[PDB]
Design a protein around this nucleic acid. Sequence first.
DNA 1: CCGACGTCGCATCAGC
DNA 2: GCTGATGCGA
DNA 3: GTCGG
Length: 326
Amino acid sequence: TLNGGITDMLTELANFEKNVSQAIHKYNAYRKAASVIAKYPHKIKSGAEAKKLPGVGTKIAEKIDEFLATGKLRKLEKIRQDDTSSSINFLTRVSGIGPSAARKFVDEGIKTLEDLRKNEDKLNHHQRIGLKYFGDFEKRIPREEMLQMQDIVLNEVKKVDSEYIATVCGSFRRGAESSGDMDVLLTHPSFTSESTKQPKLLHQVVEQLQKVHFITDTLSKGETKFMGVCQLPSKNDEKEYPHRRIDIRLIPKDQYYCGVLYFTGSDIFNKNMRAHALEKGFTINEYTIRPLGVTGVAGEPLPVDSEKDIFDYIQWKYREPKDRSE
DNA sequence: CCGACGTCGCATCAGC
DNA sequence: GCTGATGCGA
DNA sequence: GTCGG
Ligand SMILES: Nc1ccn([C@H]2C[C@H](O)[C@@H](COP(=O)(O)C(F)(F)P(=O)(O)OP(=O)(O)O)O2)c(=O)n1
Ligand SMILES: [Cl-]
Ligand SMILES: [Cl-]
Ligand SMILES: [Mg+2]
Ligand SMILES: [Mg+2]
Ligand code: NA
Ligand code: NA
């Protein structure tokens, strides 16, 4: 909140470049500049003071000067007026509707919530669910509710097979007082980088969760990644809890640390970390960290026995999950 | 300057 | 059917 | 949009 005004501006610009301009790299650029400024311990008084921080170039320095003086940004004042941008931005807020689909819908005349509801036939499964829970999905999840959700998921997974280990990651693992959704990392001794000794490992858990009516909808589902909707049960007369987004990722047990590092995030932290890895000559994914031999081809997975080992390989002092919120 | 920018799973599609 | 590329998402 | 070689 120290430099909230500036970070909010940069974020709005990031969203515009991603949704409207479909320029994913410009989006990352703003996201980064925004991230760095957010951690800066001082109240920025000029664009020059900001350009010092890495990720902030000249263009963003000027905008900051504009924002400090005027308290707003003309570039954004305009984007806000443009109907197509306003429309594309709104549509993208529906889960399942990205920049491409949004721009398309706008071409066909579909640019509002009402339009979406009277044209459900033009939406695929995912998009139809996003429309359905449009309201609920924008609501944050209190940590208290996250704890109830954790209890249900872990206790149900245990009932399916005691060898399953379920770990809630994401912002929750980073200590956040509220989350956008629930991200669950799952492991079972019967699924390793060596072999899949048992099929449907992910399926059965999803199955069980649907059985107790915790998971209510499915946006997508494969052998290792599930993306759906869930809801905490309510008591007598008690109003129902909002529907929430839940993601479950099945990861080879022996590659748990690379997995938990990946799933804990944040997204920007992971991107910055992976970038640093490359600068140091390593490549990291949710399964392992590997070296980059001259040519470029990734080498063999290095040994990993802790999240810390990963950090060491790239000469980065370890950072608690709570300090990985960039 | 200038081509890179983290990495990958699922859904959907085009070309065969 | 498959593979390879695009869209959307983690 | 930024930047390092
Ligand atoms: N582009 C991305 C997106 C995600 N992630 C990893 C790292 C993320 O921490 C993790 C979860 O994805 P999430 O989409 O639930 C998230 F990011 F929003 P979370 O941090 O959980 O915040 P919230 O509470 O709002 O959900 O996937 C990643 O590596 N790259
Ligand atoms: Cl771009
Ligand atoms: Cl790998
Ligand atoms: Mg999350
Ligand atoms: Mg998630
Ligand atoms: Na800079
Ligand atoms: Na969307």
